Amino acid sequence: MNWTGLYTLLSGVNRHSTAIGRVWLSVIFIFRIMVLVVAAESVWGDEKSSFICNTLQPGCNSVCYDQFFPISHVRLWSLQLILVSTPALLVAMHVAHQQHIEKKMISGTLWWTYVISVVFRLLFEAVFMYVFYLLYPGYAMVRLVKCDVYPCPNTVDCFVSRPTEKTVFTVFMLAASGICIILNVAEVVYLIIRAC
Amino acid sequence: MNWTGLYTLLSGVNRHSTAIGRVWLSVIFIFRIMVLVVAAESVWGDEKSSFICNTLQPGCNSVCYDQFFPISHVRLWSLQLILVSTPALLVAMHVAHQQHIEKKMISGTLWWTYVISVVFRLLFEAVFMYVFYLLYPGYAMVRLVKCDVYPCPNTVDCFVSRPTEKTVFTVFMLAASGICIILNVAEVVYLIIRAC
Ligand SMILES: CCCCCCCC/C=C\CCCCCCCC(=O)O[C@@H](COC(=O)CCCCCCCCCCCCCCC)COP(=O)([O-])OCC[N+](C)(C)C
Ligand SMILES: CCCCCCCC/C=C\CCCCCCCC(=O)O[C@@H](COC(=O)CCCCCCCCCCCCCCC)COP(=O)([O-])OCC[N+](C)(C)C
Ligand SMILES: CC(C)CCC[C@@H](C)[C@H]1CC[C@H]2[C@@H]3CC=C4C[C@@H](O)CC[C@]4(C)[C@H]3CC[C@]12C
Ligand SMILES: CC(C)CCC[C@@H](C)[C@H]1CC[C@H]2[C@@H]3CC=C4C[C@@H](O)CC[C@]4(C)[C@H]3CC[C@]12C
After folding, report:
1. Exposure string (b/e) for A79-115, b if CB count within 10 Å is 16 or more?
2. B9 vs A3: CA distance, rounded Å
3. Is any atom of ligand 4 closer than 6 Å to the C-beta of B87?
4. Alpha-carbon distance A69 to A131, whole Å?
5. Is the bond leading into B153 cis (omega within 30 degrees of zero)?
6. Burial per residue of B68-103, b for 16 or more beta-carbon CB atoms within 10 angstroms, e otherwise
7. CA quadruple A32, A33, A34, A40: dihedral positive or negative?
């Protein structure tokens, strides 16, 4: 493994991307992947097993955990990474297919599809940011929550596992997503300006 | 033990009480004593040991039981019986003392002290009825209670032991107390009418 191969793999074979999406976006993507890898198994490993409520009612822990955590942060970020990386994979596959078909026997089409893929990537980033805002208003996570879902009688106190570490990693991931959004917008603007 | 001795002991040596307070009040007193004896140990024996709340908080059962049962029905009725029987004991002791002092060496004084003792007995009956009404509004007892006393978090469901049997015995004791009140009022009225 060399640098000239890793850089080519990350950038794809596309020849229209500038240094914003070729030197900076790949680095932020690697940063997000590494943070998700080092945080998924350790911090969020026992989010449900150590989630306890102050009640004797059977089945209250599971219903309260599902009520307060419809989909955990780790899985939300994994889905966000997959959806954000899908258009880049599509562009790389399309470039490879065009190279194959020209070998066995255009620039504007590649430029347009790259612009469309960057727009879709920005749209996915914004959609996942909005979903995270809807599900979990506020970056901070609290230690104690009040759960009144059936079958829990009245309202019970349930305790979250590692609120502070999860808050730190949430801040990191949200900052990385914001940087990605800014870089995508800058890339779109630069391409439009240079094309005109 | 013969009837002519039990009747004399129950009525005392007082010669002013009519058949209302000599034949009927003693029977109702015996009825109340027997009901209290057969209900105190069995029905109310495990009122606190089997009082459970739906929570994991230590010490919530005791605080909730004390909140909802400041003083149990059995002890309230025992204190009521003792206080109601105190004036009769005082009258009997006074009659015995007068007999002793006249032997070693009046009717109006005995009549007045008997009337005063009956009035005090009626007052004690009314006071204990009012106290029971204040502490436990309504004869019926519920199975489930909502307890929000410290240290219990939020509101917890606590379960009472034998609500229906305790309701039945409460009805019996309240009916007996009402009959005693009516008989005391009738005795006072009869004495006042006959004296004038
Ligand atoms: C997302 C998770 C990240 C975790 C943190 C990772 C951080 C650290 C991880 C990785 C850092 C890199 C480690 C190896 C570096 C040596 C490379 C090398 O010598 O290349 C040379 C030889 O190499 C080859 O020909 C084969 C290259 C294999 C490298 C390892 C493959 C993946 C290992 C997966 C491990 C799985 C377990 C990992 C954990 C699950 C290059 O070939 P060459 O013939 O010299 O080139 C031509 C010669 N010429 C130039 C003179 C003309
Ligand atoms: C509040 C709780 C209530 C519970 C329900 C109770 C229901 C049932 C209970 C009780 C009913 C009565 C049982 C005994 C009746 C026999 C009486 C008798 O024969 O008397 C005779 C003899 O007797 C005596 O001389 C002594 C009397 C002792 C009686 C028992 C004393 C208390 C027992 C306590 C027990 C403790 C355990 C109880 C449970 C804790 C009378 O004497 P005599 O010499 O014949 O008289 C003169 C002779 N002449 C007439 C010919 C001139
Ligand atoms: C500018 C940034 C966004 C470019 C990022 C490039 C990403 C989307 C590309 C570069 C290399 C790609 C990987 C290359 C090889 C494989 C192995 C295959 O069995 C599953 C997909 C997987 C794991 C690809 C996933 C997508 C991937 C990680
Ligand atoms: C008209 C009605 C209210 C009269 C009722 C009479 C009551 C008050 C009298 C009759 C016999 C009495 C009992 C006779 C003997 C004793 C034994 C003594 O060591 C304690 C008190 C005790 C237990 C007395 C308590 C009061 C008593 C039960």
Report:
1. ebbebbeebbeebbebbeeeeeeeeeeeeeebeebbb
2. 113
3. no
4. 13
5. no
6. bbeeebbebbeebbebbeebbeebbebbeeeeeeee
7. positive
Helix, strand, or coil (residue B58) = coil
- Report the distance separating Cα A182 and Cα B115, nearest Å: 98
Resolution for this PDB entry, in angstroms: 3.2
Contact status, residue B121 vs residue B184, Cβ threshold 8 Å = yes
Note whether A11 and A17 are within 8 A (CB). yes
Which residue on chain A is closest to B55 by alpha carbon? A55
B143 shares contact with chain A (CB less than 8 Å): no
CB-neighbour burial class of residue A68 (10 A; exposed 0-12, middle 13-18, buried 19+) = middle
Name the residue with the closest Cα to ligand 1, atom 12. Answer: A1
Length of chain A in terms of residues written = 196
* CA angle, residues A92, A15, A183, in degrees to nearest 5: 80
Do B60 and A154 contact (CB within 8 A), yes or no?
Answer: no
Contacts of A55 in chain B (CB under 8 A): 54-56
Neighbours of B42 (CB within 10 A): 12
First to last CA, chain B: 39
Q: Please give the distance, rounded to the nearest whole angstrom, from the Cα atom of residue B6 to the centre of ligand 2.
A: 10
Torsion sign (Cα): A44, A45, A50, A52: positive
Q: How was this structure determined?
A: cryo-EM
Q: Please name every residue paired with B158 in a beta bridge, in sequence order, or none if there are none.
A: B53, B145
- Six-digit token pair at B166? 């305790």
Pocket of ligand 2 (CB under 6 A): B 1-2, 33, 37
In order of A24, A82, B89, B194, the CA distances from B14 in angstroms are 110, 100, 11, 17
- CA A89, chain centre distance (Å): 15
CA of A84, closest atom in ligand 3: 3
**Which residues, in sequence order, are CB contacts of B121 under 8 Å at separation 6+?**
B84, B87, B88, B184
CB neighbours of residue B196 within 10 Å: 5
For the record, the structure tokens of A134 come out as 């809807």
| Residue A99 neighbours by CB under 8 Å, 6+ apart | A13
Give the ligand with the smallest distance to the CA of A81.
3
| Interchain contact, A54 vs B146, CB within 8 Å | no
